[PDB]
Design a protein around this ligand. Structure first.
Ligand SMILES: CC(C)=CCC/C(C)=C(\F)COP(=O)(O)OP(=O)(O)O
Ligand SMILES: [Cl-]
Ligand SMILES: [Cl-]
Ligand SMILES: [Mg+2]
Lengths: 287, 292
């Protein structure tokens, strides 16, 4: 599925990256439009329309443009610190703030609107835990060692940015998963297995680019597992397929979770639908 | 059950004074309204070179984590405490209205952050807050009552065991900060992770009989349920601990190259590695000797 409001949202988002001074110039605008990053929000949140869809598109595009920064290391680290302070303390973007910070704040003021203090606290923490992965990326690049597969995955569970994007699904879907359910290992496991699937797919999409330039799960498996490329790729495919099977087993336990905790079944089913829609959306967009 | 942790058995020589002071501190903090548990000793095992006020801080922080844990074993109160501590850490601010567990944490944190750089404070704040994040999960899972699968149990434990803030504490009381470019590397993060895995695994074995008797979560029990016989599950957990120690040592053998690649002095990396190993060995020796 794709949101029916994509055409308007795409054109608006291309103006927004220009207005935020993130994508400057005819060549950069064309490159950015060709990348179809301006569309993923409509695949990952296929029921969002209007301003909700704009927020999804802007946030997704922001994460791509943030990622582009690292590929001027002190500048990127300075951004991580300014964003951390904005999230932790509510410090405002200023005229001296770089475009990437101004644009994040523009997204975040919309994303936190209408959400409870509890949701804001857990979502702030997820944003900052995503930011915590980027110093690691820079340090690992400077080190130059091939990460072992498990260490690569621990790092990517931060930089892939799934958990803030799952929080965004609540914000645009119009609900908050009740606290007693959201913190359960059953739902955290659904977040974790969805993230594993998305990471695995992304590692395969990114393989050739990463090898030409960066860390990649396939390369780590070759180096540390003594696997051939084909064998390592099979291992990643098995990770994705096993993560989907695990997600489905957990999802079949949501009625019992609802009964045990006194939580309405509808909100649990809706949240699980959002996680699977994000995964399916990234998969379809990536093809 | 004994494991070949790569650090010698040692205890701080200042344990006697530190223990008696800590019991006075928990009373003055109005936390105990505990001595017999011997929790007041782990700090001298986990930080065997600390003395004086440095050791007191270690003992107080460790004891605080056990007394915080006791809250869960008034759930709305515990969540309100997590929220207040999170805001205190994030915003850089305890007040007269704060409950005793918050006053006591702030008492610890003001000593723990003293003399440390803004960079260290930022990463350590994040570690403290990630630990606070595990307790809503512990309360939710208790209310749910389902047997966690082994991987989910370990993911939850990696927050609540409180190893990462305690590794940061080793820098504070040791007198050094690992340079930023090395601290954030996956090489050192992997040494933190494998140390934590080993401590978790040892604790699951130490606690097995109690957890099963009292019907609480335990990795061995999760493996029986979702996997194994009792003995097979115990062997699996022992293999986890030994594999984590072996992985830590393989990572440690790369510290000279890390130091050369990053322009970081070899001495501070070895000192950090020794602190992680001393913590693991300290927990090993302490846990092997009444709580369980
Ligand atoms: C939204 C999710 C779940 C995943 C996307 C992860 C990102 C930001 C990339 F793979 C960057 O892709 P890109 O084509 O921009 O690669 P380069 O920036 O290296 O050219
Ligand atoms: Cl609730
Ligand atoms: Cl540095
Ligand atoms: Mg890009």
């Amino acid at each position: 599925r794709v949101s029916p409001d994509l055409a308007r949202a795409r054109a608006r988002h291309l103006d927004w990256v220009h207005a935020m001074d993130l994508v400057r110039g005819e060549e950069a605008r064309r490159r950015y439009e060709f990348s179809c990053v301006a569309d993923i929000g409509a695949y990952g949140y296929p029921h969002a329309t209007g301003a909700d869809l704009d927020l999804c598109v802007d946030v997704l595009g922001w994460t791509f443009l943030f990622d582009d920064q690292f590929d001027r290391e002190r500048d990127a680290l300075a951004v991580c610190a300014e964003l951390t302070d904005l999230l932790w303390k509510g410090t405002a973007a200023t005229a001296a703030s770089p475009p990437i910070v101004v644009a994040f704040s523009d997204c975040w003021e919309r994303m936190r609107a209408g959400m409870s203090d509890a949701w804001r606290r857990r979502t702030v923490h997820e944003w900052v835990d995503y930011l915590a992965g980027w110093p690691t990326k820079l340090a690992d690049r400077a080190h130059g060692a091939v990460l072992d597969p498990a260490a690569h995955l621990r790092a990517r569970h931060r930089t892939i940015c799934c958990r803030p994007l799952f929080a965004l699904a609540e914000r645009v879907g119009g609900y908050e998963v009740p606290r007693r359910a959201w913190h359960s290992s059953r739902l955290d496991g659904m977040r974790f297995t969805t993230s594993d699937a998305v990471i695995g797919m992304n590692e395969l999409h990114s393989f050739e680019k990463d090898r030409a330039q960066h860390a990649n799960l396939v390369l780590s498996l070759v180096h540390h597992g003594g696997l051939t490329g084909p064998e390592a790729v099979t291992r990643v495919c098995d990770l994705v397929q096993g993560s989907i099977e695990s997600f489905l087993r957990l999802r079949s336990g949501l009625p019992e979770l609802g009964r045990a905790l006194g939580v309405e079944g509808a909100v649990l089913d809706r949240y699980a639908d959002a996680l699977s829609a994000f995964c399916r959306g990234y998969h379809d967009w990536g093809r």
